[PDB]
Design a protein around this ligand. Structure first.
Ligand SMILES: [Cl-]
Lengths: 303, 303
């Protein structure tokens, strides 16, 4: 009973978190095997970030300039290199707490858990969605860069995000663990803006199914619609177009509730045009779009 | 930047989670030193929970009836006893991953992180508040009993909650780690209802301060009020009366924003009587009351 935004257990990731310092700049690194991954702008001074030439800046750095601390123990840097927007610092010691892991570039509309860290020390965990405009809405202060986002299946940790920067709208941007940014963002302190923040339509429907499973059903009506009809309404409110693949993905939720996807679409169409009328769904007064269909099935089945 | 509901890193607690089985009933236990704590209704059959005599039921149980599994390794039970509504199973092995810990009975209006578990395996982490009616709004399925709530200061884990039961409204009830329920609830399958769900007024103000810190300030007005005046408005909407101790607790947030507590109270008074007018605060369309003043300061300062 109950439906909550719930992150993965962070124990496997806490053991990989270290501190990386270059001059006066300190952020977080990810220690897996004998490599520490961190944002490359650790090598920037405050004046460098206006228009940094990372190639030229990294040339005057040596291994001994990268201070890597795992708790109270200093690690010995024996190599360094740049891969896109991340630095890889080779250390002489493999992380004994390295879990089975992979690097994945997550798709927009998918979710992951963030372990927010400061000075190599975990601070807290929360869920984020990779929004269609390739930003996330998290909680990151100064020094939180290098905090990572991840998913867990069984016992393998899939790292998908590392935090780099914040945008004027208050949203956040970063890279995958290969150093490639999500979206068009670049790691310089220049005027950058996130595009239109479109809503993840399939996720809203999954969350409406979660509400029905949890006993909330005031928003169900006697109506149905079609994909083309609903998408005409989804366009005005900047919702993503719903596809048959989205319908099939919602199959498990439609089968458990007995509510056909297009019937649920008619409910969402009425919620978009008429509003909620001061009522709530799963304790929210707006439509939630950061729960994937997998998130709903996982939480409502207890995996 | 950004403000999110964020749980504590769960690594220290994951290492204490075990599975406890009695007959066909399986739930979670908390393994600290050589004792495993679990809800006492593990000894109940489905027919027992209607009106269980736990004393009489525990008499026909022996140590070898309690199956305790830590991962894939079975633990040897050498003693058992009842303390209020929890059982304490003594095992012949101390948990090598036992963190520094304490048992605390949390006050209503305070928050804690929940590690939801099934069959002794962590499933996810999320924040809950101990509501004034001594219920929490979490995410617990069958088999989730024995999952614990906790806080962390520096490196000491303060266990404050263990899950026992769910109420017809969809809310959740449990005990402290001494087995004493929060609120008037009893561990039997009888008609039980949560009382009036009053709002944690000091927490709403802390969350309004968090919004101001994060750039949201559309709800600020040119007005002020008094404690007695605001409390006349807090009564109609079932808000807790605000006290000078609440004002002092909000001191750090009032000082950082420069907005006097009573000025913020005038904003909340207008939000209660006029609503939000379709606008949002920190991405929410209603007033959040599950962030303590400490939660706001911690997240906005990066502890
Ligand atoms: Cl809301």
């Amino acid at each position: 009973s109950g439906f909550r935004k719930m992150a993965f257990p962070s124990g496997k990731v806490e053991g990989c978190m270290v501190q990386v310092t270059c001059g006066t700049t300190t952020l977080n690194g990810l220690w897996l095997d004998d490599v520490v991954y961190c944002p490359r702008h650790v090598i920037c001074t405050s004046e460098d970030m206006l228009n940094p030439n990372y190639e030229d800046l990294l040339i005057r750095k040596s291994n001994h300039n990268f201070l890597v601390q795992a708790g109270n123990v200093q690690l010995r840097v024996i190599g360094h290199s740049m891969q896109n927007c991340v630095l890889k610092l080779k250390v002489d010691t493999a992380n004994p707490k390295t879990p089975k892991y992979k690097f994945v570039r997550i798709q927009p509309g998918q979710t992951f858990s963030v372990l927010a860290c400061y000075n190599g020390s975990p601070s807290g965990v929360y869920q984020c969605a990779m929004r269609p405009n390739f930003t996330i809405k998290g909680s990151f202060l100064n020094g939180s860069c290098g905090s990572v986002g991840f998913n867990i299946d069984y016992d393998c940790v899939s790292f998908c995000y590392m935090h780099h920067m914040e945008l004027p709208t208050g949203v956040h941007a970063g890279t995958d663990l290969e150093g490639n940014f999500y979206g068009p963002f670049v790691d310089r302190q220049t005027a950058q803006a996130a595009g239109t923040d479109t809503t993840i339509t399939v996720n809203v429907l999954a969350w409406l199914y979660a509400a029905v499973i949890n006993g909330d059903r005031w928003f169900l009506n006697r109506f149905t619609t079609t994909l083309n009809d609903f998408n005409l309404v989804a366009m005005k409110y900047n919702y993503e177009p719903l596809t048959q693949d989205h319908v099939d993905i919602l199959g498990p939720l439609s089968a458990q509730t007995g509510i056909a996807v297009l019937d649920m679409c008619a409910s969402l169409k009425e919620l978009l045009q008429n509003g909620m009328n001061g009522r709530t769904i799963l304790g929210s007064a707006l439509l939630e779009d950061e729960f994937t269909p997998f998130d709903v099935v996982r939480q409502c089945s207890g995996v």
